[PDB]
Design a protein around this ligand. Structure first.
Ligand SMILES: Nc1ncnc2c1ncn2[C@@H]1O[C@H](COP(=O)(O)OP(=O)(O)NP(=O)(O)O)[C@@H](O)[C@H]1O
Ligand SMILES: [Mg+2]
Length: 146
């Protein structure tokens, strides 16, 4: 399947988000080596990452960090923020379908339930954890990279 360099896609997403949240002054740092790529449908990668990155910008206090690594069959994108995080007791239910009635602000994404379902199409998943900053750590994993 087609190969998509990750850095440029994340750059496109950040740029769009920097606008939506320009008033908040979120500082988004990226550590994505140039060779890291995503194998699959570009829009799938962007829908998942757009939802996770929008959440980080929305809930952070100021800092958001994005990093990535890849192995032979998997791609790992980690998004960390310095916000309140996701309570231990909620790191499960946030991936289930909820009452998302008209929450369609122009920057809203597909939601985490749908984002996880997309990663599962690639034999992947999304793991909710805690960052060093104490806020959320979301690790997005896509499989089927070989
Ligand atoms: N980075 C984060 N920091 C704190 N809470 C988060 C974070 N990411 C997700 N959540 C929580 O998980 C919930 C569901 O995620 P998601 O499915 O993206 O929400 P949504 O319905 O699309 N609305 P929104 O939280 O504006 O993205 C959110 O409403 C938050 O309560
Ligand atoms: Mg969302």
């Amino acid at each position: 399947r087609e190969l998509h360099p990750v850095a440029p896609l994340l750059d496109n997403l950040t740029s769009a988000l920097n606008k939506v949240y320009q008033r908040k002054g979120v500082n988004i740092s990226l550590d994505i080596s140039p060779e890291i790529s995503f194998v699959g449908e570009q829009n799938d990668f962007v829908e998942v990452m757009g939802n996770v990155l929008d959440n980080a910008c929305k809930y952070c206090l100021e800092f958001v960090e994005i990093s990535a690594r890849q192995t032979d069959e998997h791609l790992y994108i980690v998004v960390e923020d310095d916000g309140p995080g996701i309570p231990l007791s909620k790191r499960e239910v946030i991936f289930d379908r909820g009452q998302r009635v008209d929450t369609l602000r122009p920057g809203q994404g597909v939601g985490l339930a749908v984002a996880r379902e997309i990663t599962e199409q690639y034999e992947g998943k999304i793991v909710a954890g805690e960052s060093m900053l104490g806020g959320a750590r979301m690790e997005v994993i896509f499989g089927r990279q070989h």
